Scaffold this motif. Structure first.
Motif, PDB file in Angstrom:
ATOM      1  N   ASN A  67       0.824  -1.204   0.000  1.00  0.00           N
ATOM      2  CA  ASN A  67       0.000   0.000   0.000  1.00  0.00           C
ATOM      3  C   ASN A  67       0.860   1.257   0.000  1.00  0.00           C
ATOM      4  O   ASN A  67       0.558   2.223  -0.709  1.00  0.00           O
ATOM      5  CB  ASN A  67      -0.934  -0.005   1.208  1.00  0.00           C
ATOM      6  CG  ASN A  67      -2.314  -0.528   0.875  1.00  0.00           C
ATOM      7  OD1 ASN A  67      -2.844  -0.268  -0.204  1.00  0.00           O
ATOM      8  ND2 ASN A  67      -2.904  -1.273   1.802  1.00  0.00           N
ATOM      9  N   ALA A  68       1.934   1.261   0.794  1.00  0.00           N
ATOM     10  CA  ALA A  68       2.804   2.432   0.853  1.00  0.00           C
ATOM     11  C   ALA A  68       3.484   2.688  -0.487  1.00  0.00           C
ATOM     12  O   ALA A  68       3.574   3.837  -0.935  1.00  0.00           O
ATOM     13  CB  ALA A  68       3.844   2.258   1.959  1.00  0.00           C
ATOM     14  N   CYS A  69       3.969   1.633  -1.142  1.00  0.00           N
ATOM     15  CA  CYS A  69       4.632   1.777  -2.431  1.00  0.00           C
ATOM     16  C   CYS A  69       3.659   2.004  -3.579  1.00  0.00           C
ATOM     17  O   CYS A  69       4.092   2.411  -4.662  1.00  0.00           O
ATOM     18  CB  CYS A  69       5.487   0.543  -2.724  1.00  0.00           C
ATOM     19  SG  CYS A  69       7.246   0.756  -2.377  1.00  0.00           S
ATOM     20  N   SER A  70       2.366   1.749  -3.375  1.00  0.00           N
ATOM     21  CA  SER A  70       1.390   1.980  -4.434  1.00  0.00           C
ATOM     22  C   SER A  70       1.256   3.467  -4.742  1.00  0.00           C
ATOM     23  O   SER A  70       1.475   3.901  -5.879  1.00  0.00           O
ATOM     24  CB  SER A  70       0.038   1.383  -4.039  1.00  0.00           C
ATOM     25  OG  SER A  70      -0.072   0.040  -4.476  1.00  0.00           O
ATOM     26  N   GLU A  71       0.897   4.269  -3.737  1.00  0.00           N
ATOM     27  CA  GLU A  71       0.732   5.700  -3.956  1.00  0.00           C
ATOM     28  C   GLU A  71       2.061   6.439  -4.041  1.00  0.00           C
ATOM     29  O   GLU A  71       2.099   7.558  -4.564  1.00  0.00           O
ATOM     30  CB  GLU A  71      -0.139   6.312  -2.852  1.00  0.00           C
ATOM     31  CG  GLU A  71       0.624   7.075  -1.779  1.00  0.00           C
ATOM     32  CD  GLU A  71       1.320   6.161  -0.793  1.00  0.00           C
ATOM     33  OE1 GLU A  71       1.018   4.950  -0.792  1.00  0.00           O
ATOM     34  OE2 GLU A  71       2.169   6.652  -0.020  1.00  0.00           O
ATOM     35  N   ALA A  72       3.148   5.842  -3.549  1.00  0.00           N
ATOM     36  CA  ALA A  72       4.463   6.460  -3.657  1.00  0.00           C
ATOM     37  C   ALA A  72       5.095   6.270  -5.029  1.00  0.00           C
ATOM     38  O   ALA A  72       6.138   6.877  -5.296  1.00  0.00           O
ATOM     39  CB  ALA A  72       5.398   5.903  -2.582  1.00  0.00           C
ATOM     40  N   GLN A  73       4.497   5.445  -5.890  1.00  0.00           N
ATOM     41  CA  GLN A  73       4.977   5.210  -7.252  1.00  0.00           C
ATOM     42  C   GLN A  73       6.403   4.654  -7.245  1.00  0.00           C
ATOM     43  O   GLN A  73       7.341   5.252  -7.775  1.00  0.00           O
ATOM     44  CB  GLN A  73       4.882   6.487  -8.095  1.00  0.00           C
ATOM     45  CG  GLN A  73       3.468   7.017  -8.266  1.00  0.00           C
ATOM     46  CD  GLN A  73       2.423   5.918  -8.273  1.00  0.00           C
ATOM     47  OE1 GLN A  73       2.391   5.082  -9.176  1.00  0.00           O
ATOM     48  NE2 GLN A  73       1.564   5.914  -7.261  1.00  0.00           N
ATOM     49  N   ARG A  74       6.549   3.486  -6.627  1.00  0.00           N
ATOM     50  CA  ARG A  74       7.826   2.804  -6.525  1.00  0.00           C
ATOM     51  C   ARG A  74       7.663   1.352  -6.947  1.00  0.00           C
ATOM     52  O   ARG A  74       6.612   0.749  -6.708  1.00  0.00           O
ATOM     53  CB  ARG A  74       8.369   2.876  -5.089  1.00  0.00           C
ATOM     54  CG  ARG A  74       9.877   2.741  -4.960  1.00  0.00           C
ATOM     55  CD  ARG A  74      10.375   2.727  -3.511  1.00  0.00           C
ATOM     56  NE  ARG A  74      10.183   3.992  -2.808  1.00  0.00           N
ATOM     57  CZ  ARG A  74       9.073   4.359  -2.181  1.00  0.00           C
ATOM     58  NH1 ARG A  74       8.029   3.551  -2.087  1.00  0.00           N
ATOM     59  NH2 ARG A  74       9.015   5.562  -1.616  1.00  0.00           N
TER      60      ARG A  74
END
Ligand SMILES: [Mn+2]
Length: 150
Positions: A67-74
């Motif tokens: 979830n954290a990397c989803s909106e962070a675009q990673r």
RNA sequence: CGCCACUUCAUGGAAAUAAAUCACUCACGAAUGUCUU
């Protein structure tokens, strides 16, 4: 660690169900000897199943980070695959070397990185061009026709 | 009622037009993956 262990167990189960032989599955590393096609399924079907299992285990055990990397675009964790199909009498050492070359050099894009690093021009902008999530596949016939692609 | 013949001997238009232009199959198979000193 939980995700890796669950993926290892599920990958062993999938390799046995497909009809192959698990050589070594530990951590992020997998080595399997499988038929080219048996009971209607292909090698690439097994590869797709293994990738799906890895993604499922990552989602199940790493949902907060996903979830954290989803909106962070990673980029997310992924599996690079190297497949070599050879005649049964073709030397097993050469087949293993071909599989290693496929995976590392092509699937992990280590040709680009190795050539850059031997000349000491790796930098960081060039490091921005390292490509992962690749499938390297080679089929060498009994006459040495060798079809390869990535 | 009688008498009597000449003239003319192919020009104009259409002179090729469309469809299919390679298709399917085989694209390497078998032996040898080391041997004899
Ligand atoms: Mn590894």
């Amino acid at each position: 660690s939980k995700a890796l262990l669950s993926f290892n167990i599920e990958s062993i189960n999938e390799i046995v169900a497909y009809g192959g032989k698990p050589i070594f599955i530990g951590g992020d590393d997998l080595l399997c000897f499988a038929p080219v096609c048996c009971n209607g399924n292909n090698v690439f079907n097994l590869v797709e199943k293994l990738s799906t299992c890895f993604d499922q285990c990552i989602n199940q055990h790493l949902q907060q980070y996903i979830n954290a990397c989803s909106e962070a675009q990673r980029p997310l964790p992924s599996l690079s695959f190297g497949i070599s199909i050879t005649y049964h009498k073709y030397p097993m050492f050469e087949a293993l070397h071909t599989t290693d070359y496929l995976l590392e050099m092509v699937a992990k894009d280590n040709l680009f990185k190795y050539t850059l690093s031997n000349k000491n021009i790796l930098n960081e902008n060039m490091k921005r061009f390292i490509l992962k999530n690749k499938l390297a596949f080679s089929l060498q016939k009994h006459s040495g026709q060798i079809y390869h692609t990535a």
